[PDB]
Amino acid sequence: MITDLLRAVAPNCKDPEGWGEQLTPAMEKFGIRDREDIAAFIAQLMVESGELNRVVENLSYSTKRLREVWPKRFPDDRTAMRYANNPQALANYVYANRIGNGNEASGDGWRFRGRGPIQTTGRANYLQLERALGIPVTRKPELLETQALGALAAAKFWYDNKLTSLALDIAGGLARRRQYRDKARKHL
Ligand SMILES: [Br-]
Ligand SMILES: [Br-]
């Protein structure tokens, strides 16, 4: 049971029974069935969502952190200062003209910021999420903050990554992710 797995890996994770009910059919439908497969998925889910407490991207950055995370977009402090402690301006600038988004003026960067326990980001990915799930998340992107579509989108995002991984074989912090995984892998 995913619910009792979410507890063994993160006894302090938020609402493991509500997420457990939603994650289980999303995992089963997207083929997240194998032993290690489930453990890694859950681990990635646990670190990206802050043990199920975060379903929207963190966009509060120091004037220093920005220069690191995005060194091209933020070359000097005169630049990185205007966008530090301004989550909307930050998203609109750093995500501008990327992953399907319009320019800074369009507001796409903030509109399509990361959402879900494992995050979907950018107009093109919401559009693709919309096509695959049949839910108008392009117009209503905050529907990925729900348990039901966050789980389905989290699971579809992991499924997409296995497709890529599989598709290449045919054509032949990070310690946090490790804790969960082995703590999860300990379960069978
Ligand atoms: Br809007
Ligand atoms: Br639109």
Side-chain angles (χ1 to χ4, degrees), residues 1-77 79-188:
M1 194 135 264
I2 298 299
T3 271
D4 297 338
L5 174 66
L6 300 165
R7 291 229 192 70
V9 179
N12 36 352
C13 66
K14 189 81 184 304
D15 183 24
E17 308 177 83
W19 281 108
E21 269 145 58
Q22 293 317 297
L23 281 167
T24 306
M27 294 173 77
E28 220 278 338
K29 282 170 231 277
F30 274 112
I32 304 154
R33 298 173 193 150
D34 282 296
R35 309 103 180 94
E36 299 266 351
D37 208 43
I38 301 179
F41 173 69
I42 291 296
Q44 166 78 291
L45 196 299
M46 280 295 94
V47 55
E48 199 171 329
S49 74
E51 313 191 326
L52 295 186
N53 291 290
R54 163 174 345 265
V55 285
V56 202
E57 184 177 350
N58 197 317
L59 270 151
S60 175
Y61 286 78
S62 153
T63 301
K64 301 114 126 326
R65 196 83 173 264
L66 280 181
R67 279 151 70 64
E68 324 178 347
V69 189
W70 295 287
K72 325 276 222 165
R73 287 147 202 95
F74 300 112
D76 48 316
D77 325 87
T79 305
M81 68 114 84
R82 309 185 267 117
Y83 295 106
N85 287 288
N86 198 317
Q88 180 168 17
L90 174 49
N92 285 330
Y93 169 62
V94 307
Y95 295 139
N97 317 294
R98 290 199 159 273
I99 38 182
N101 289 338
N103 64 13
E104 184 178 28
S106 79
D108 277 359
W110 173 249
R111 174 177 296 111
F112 295 114
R113 63 187 182 287
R115 278 184 194 79
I118 294 172
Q119 297 175 18
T120 303
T121 314
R123 177 177 290 272
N125 293 320
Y126 281 85
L127 183 72
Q128 232 176 301
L129 202 50
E130 160 150 34
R131 306 209 174 289
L133 306 195
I135 70 202
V137 290
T138 305
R139 159 100 178 295
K140 326 217 62 183
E142 76 286 355
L143 297 171
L144 294 200
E145 300 188 23
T146 65
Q147 300 211 312
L149 298 181
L152 209 63
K156 161 166 169 80
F157 179 105
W158 179 273
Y159 171 74
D160 290 344
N161 266 1
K162 260 310 316 283
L163 301 189
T164 307
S165 153
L166 172 49
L168 305 198
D169 296 292
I170 281 170
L174 272 146
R176 249 273 182 261
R177 206 204 160 276
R178 289 310 294 112
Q179 286 162 120
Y180 297 119
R181 188 175 185 193
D182 301 339
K183 270 182 184 85
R185 188 49 246 206
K186 237 171 293 185
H187 261 212
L188 283 191

